[PDB]
């Protein structure tokens, strides 16, 4: 029946929402790691030049 | 209102529907004087105002039935309405403000959370986890309190109940959403490690992979800190090597890219002396074939495939050097060989055997280019050049002996003629190696 | 039926929008990294002048 059809639609939007949520989370984590890393690299070059 | 999570999994939805479906009358408790009549009135009114005004008024009133609860159903409905009003679209941030103004207001609430039956240790903990990492409210107190919870200990360690296990685990990851608040979670991580290894073992055999996915997600989020990831693979090698096989065999690419990125974080240069990790993992874990098959495999996500190629390349980087095949590459590039048991040891020959032919026998072409260049031009046999060309003859001999399809090139590269022309030389050793290679081309006809 | 088609198209739009948010967050992470590098640069210049 159509009830399971609309429920399946909402389920699809739910799966896409979960995929997008996990993706955004992975983006934030990668953002933390990359920020720390880039800051570390800049700090390394700066420390070398300063030394 | 502000950062309300855990609305994704259908488990938390069915749970919230099952708990909030309980029948309890606050007006009957007000009429029987079971609790504060004012608080019971505000609760009975808020129930109808919810199921279908601002907050902070009934905040203090609910605390009367929170800090002091004569009935379990009363406290259960109180915490249920608490978490439901916290995630409510109508109230939302306003409710959060009630927690944000006074940090000690939720402290006792967290003290009354996680006690007795498994049903009552869920919701109060849900609101508490919701507030601990909410917006501006952050405390090491809630973490230290939740970490020592024996009521929640069995809830998270329950391998029987998947619902409670998934609720406690998803709450664990959600509370670890702030890596700075994950330090204590990383210190007490020994208890979460067991359920993780259990999810991994259960992985090796509907929405049931979502739990293992959130767990691996907590693992990768904890690997985000190089310190916690430093003791990651330095603790359990057994549970670690079970990643790639079960991830590749895993249908969904969520847990696949999770184990891939987590293991990549484990062998990453970001980790101090992480070389031993990738080394043992490719040694006792046979990660060579796993990385080869995974690189030959396909992935829907761009990040999964990119991290796959990067991790495979990272492994292949130090795997080729053990047994250093690049060591001979330096001699070939510098066009100067020496005395080493590189082509002499059968093991070394087996190690670089797979790297002998890449694209149109690129390595083999680079192998014959040196001898051919030492043939058509130059070709003065004294000291160095002789022993080097002889070593190249024996090496190319072991190569052609190993690779039966490597003959077709030697004829088209002019190598058959140079090898045959090497039959007569000044040195008996050069002639011996050249005759050995001649018999080698004569080995298969 | 149409509700499902719209939910699916909007799901694709939500996935692409989440990907875009990830890209914007990545560029923003690079920007914060350059800014932190700038602060570290000013601090290093101050330390060099002080030395």
Touching subunits of A (3+ CB pairs, under 8 Å) are B, C
Please answer whether residues B226 and B270 qualify as being in contact, where contact means their C-beta atoms are separated by less than 8 angstroms.
Answer: yes
Residues B168 and B158: their CA atoms lie apart, in Å, by 9
Residue with the two structure tokens 């670690």: B240
Residue of A nearest to B207 (CA): A15
> Would an 8 Å CB–CB cutoff place A39 in contact with chain B?
no
Residue with tokens 């000013």: C42
Q: Which residues in B lie closer than 8 A to residue A22 (C-beta atoms)?
A: 213, 217, 254
Which two tokens mark C15? Answer: 């996935």
- Resolution in angstroms comes to 6.2
Which helix H or strand E contains B401, and what residues bound it? helix B384-402
Which chain A residues have a beta carbon less than 8 Å from that of B213? 22
List, as one string, the DSSP characters of B332-395.
Answer: HHTT---S-TTTTSHHHHHHSGGGS-SSSSHHHHHHHHHHHHHHHS----STHHHHHHHHHHHH
Q: At what angle do helices B120-132 and B72-86 cross, to 10 degrees?
A: 30
Query: DSSP characters for A7-38?
Result: HHHHHHHHHHHHHHHHHHHHHHHHHHHHHHHH
- Tokens for B86? 């916290």
- Give the C window 1-51 contacts with A, CB below 8 Å: 1, 3-4, 7-8, 10-12, 14-15, 17-19, 21-22, 25-26, 28-30, 32-33, 36-37, 40-41, 44, 47-48
Closest CA to B433 of B444, B422, B445: B422
Nearest-Å Rg of the Cα atoms of chain A is 22
The set of long-range contacts for A22-26, using a CB threshold of 8 Å and a minimum separation of 24, is A22/B213, A22/B217, A22/B254, A23/C15, A23/C18, A23/C19, A23/C22, A24/C18, A24/C21, A24/C22, A24/C25, A25/B217, A26/B303
Residue B371 contacts residue B389 (beta carbons within 8 Å): yes
Neighbours of A16 (CB within 10 A): 19
Residue B31 to residue B34: CA distance in whole angstroms: 8
Contacts of B249 (CB under 8 A, 6+ apart): none
Which token pair is B177?
């959403």
Which method was used?
X-ray
Closest chain B residue to A16 measured between Cα atoms? B8
Q: Which of residues 191-220 of B touch A (CB under 8 A)?
A: 213, 217, 220
SS3 B324: strand
> Would you kindly state where each structural domain of chain B is located, as residue ranges?
11-325, 326-445
Breaks (C-N over 2.5 A) in chain B follow: 52, 205
How would CATH label the architecture of B11-325?
A: Alpha Horseshoe (1.25)
Cβ distance of C1 and A10 shorter than 8 Å: no
| Nearest residue of chain A to residue C38 (CA atoms) | A42
Structure tokens at B330: 């330096």
Residue B189 CB neighbours (<10 A): 21
Cβ atoms of B437 and B396 closer than 8 Å: yes
Tokens of B257: 């890219």
Burial of B121 (0-12, 13-18, 19+ CB in 10 A): buried
Q: Rounded to whole angstroms, what are the CA distances from B187 to B144, B199, C31? A: 11, 20, 33
Whether the ω angle into residue B62 lies within 30 degrees of 0, i.e. cis, is no
Q: How many residues does chain A have?
A: 51
> b/e string for B41-57 if b means 16 or more Cβ within 10 A?
bbbbebbeeeeeeebee
Closest CA to B287 of B245, B234, B239, B249: B245
∠ CA C16-C17-C20, rounded to 5°: 90
- Write the DSSP symbol of residue B405: G
Partners of B324 in the beta sheet? Answer: B321
Q: Is B217 in Cβ contact with A18 (below 8 Å)?
A: no
Write the DSSP string, B53-65: --SSTTHHHHHHH
The candidate with the shortest Cα–Cα distance to C12, out of B86, B347, B1, A17, is: A17
Q: Quote the CA–CA distance of B278 and B220 in Å, as a whole number.
A: 17
Q: How many CB atoms lie within 10 A of CB B361?
A: 20
Return the SS3 of B2. Answer: coil
Query: Can you tell me the distance from the alpha carbon of B299 to that of B153, in angstroms, rounded to the nearest whole number?
Result: 37
Q: How far is Cα B110 from Cα B84, in angstroms, rounded to an integer?
A: 16
Check CB contact under 8 Å for B224 and A29: yes
Whole-angstrom distance, CA of residue B176 vs CA of residue B189: 11
B326-445: CATH superfamily: V-type ATPase, subunit H, C-terminal domain (1.25.40.150)
Residues of chain A with C-beta less than 8 angstroms from the C-beta of B303? 26
Q: Which of A11, A18, A41 to mutate to test the interface with B (most CBs of B within 10 A)?
A: A18
From CA B152, how far away is CA B121, in angstroms rounded?
Answer: 7
Q: What are phi and psi of B358, to 5 degrees?
A: -110, -75
Calculate the alpha carbon distances from B229 to B198, B240, B291 in Å: 20, 12, 21
Q: Which residues of A touch C12 (CB under 8 A)?
A: 16
What is the residue-wise DSSP string for B71-109?
-HHHHHHHHHHHHHHHS-SSSTHHHHHHHHH-TTTTHHH
> What 3-state class would DSSP assign to C21?
helix
Best to test chain A binding among C8, C22, C50 (most A CBs inside 10 Å):
C22
The answer to whether A31 and C29 are in contact (CB under 8 A) is yes
CB contact under 8 A, B224 and A25: no
């Amino acid at each position: 029946t159509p009830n399971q059809v609309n429920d399946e639609l909402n389920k699809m939007q739910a799966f896409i929402r979960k995929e997008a949520e996990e993706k955004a989370k992975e983006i934030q984590l990668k953002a933390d790691q990359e920020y720390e890393i880039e800051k570390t690299n800049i700090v390394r070059n700066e420390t070398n030049n300063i030394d | 209102g502000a950062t309300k999570i855990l609305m994704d999994s259908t488990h938390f939805n069915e749970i919230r529907s099952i708990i909030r479906s309980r029948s309890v009358a606050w007006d009957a408790l007000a009429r029987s004087e079971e609790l504060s009549e004012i608080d019971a009135s505000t609760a009975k009114a808020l129930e109808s105002i919810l199921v279908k005004k601002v907050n902070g008024k009934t905040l203090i009133p609910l605390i009367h039935l929170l800090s002091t609860s004569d009935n379990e159903d009363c406290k259960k409905s109180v915490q249920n309405l608490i978490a439901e009003l916290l995630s409510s679209d109508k109230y939302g941030d306003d409710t959060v403000k009630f927690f944000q103004e006074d940090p000690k207001q939720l402290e006792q609430l967290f003290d009354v959370s996680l006690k007795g039956d498994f049903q009552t240790v869920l919701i109060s903990g849900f609101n508490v986890v919701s507030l601990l990492v909410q917006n501006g409210l952050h405390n090491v107190k809630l973490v230290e309190k939740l970490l020592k919870n024996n009521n929640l200990i069995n809830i998270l360690q329950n391998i029987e109940q998947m619902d409670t296990c998934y609720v406690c685990i998803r709450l664990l990851q959600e509370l670890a959403v702030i890596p700075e608040y994950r330090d204590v979670i990383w210190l007490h991580e020994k208890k979460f490690m067991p359920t993780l290894f259990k999810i991994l073992q259960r992985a090796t055999d509907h929405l049931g992979i979502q739990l293992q996915y959130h767990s691996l997600l907590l693992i990768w989020l904890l690997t985000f800190n190089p310190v916690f990831a430093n003791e990651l693979v330095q603790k359990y090698l057994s549970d670690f090597l079970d990643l790639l096989k079960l991830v590749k065999i895993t249908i969904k690419e969520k847990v696949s890219r999770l184990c891939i990125s987590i293991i990549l974080q484990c062998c990453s240069t970001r980790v101090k002396q992480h070389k031993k990790v990738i080394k043992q993992l490719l040694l006792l874990g046979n990660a060579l074939p796993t990385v080869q098959s995974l690189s030959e495999r396909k992935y829907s996500d761009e990040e999964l495939r990119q991290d796959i190629s990067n991790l495979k390349e990272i492994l292949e980087n130090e795997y080729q050097e053990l047994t250093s095949f690049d060591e001979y590459v330096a001699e070939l590039d510098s066009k100067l060989l020496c005395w080493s048991p590189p082509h002499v040891d059968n093991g070394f020959w087996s190690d670089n055997i797979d790297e002998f032919k890449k694209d149109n026998y690129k390595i083999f072409r680079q192998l014959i280019e040196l001898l051919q260049a030492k043939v058509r031009n130059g070709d003065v046999n004294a000291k160095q050049e002789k022993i080097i060309i002889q070593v190249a003859l024996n090496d190319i001999t072991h190569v052609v002996e190993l690779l039966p399809e490597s003959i077709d090139v030697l004829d088209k590269t002019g190598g058959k003629a140079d090898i045959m022309e090497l039959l007569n030389h000044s040195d008996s050793r050069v002639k011996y190696e050249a005759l050995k290679a001649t018999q080698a081309i004569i080995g298969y006809t | 039926q149409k509700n499902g088609i719209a939910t699916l198209l909007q799901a694709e739009k939500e996935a692409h929008e989440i990907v875009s948010k990830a890209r914007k967050y990545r560029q923003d992470k690079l920007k914060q990294a350059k800014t932190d590098a700038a602060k570290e640069i000013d601090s290093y210049k101050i330390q060099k002048d002080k030395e």
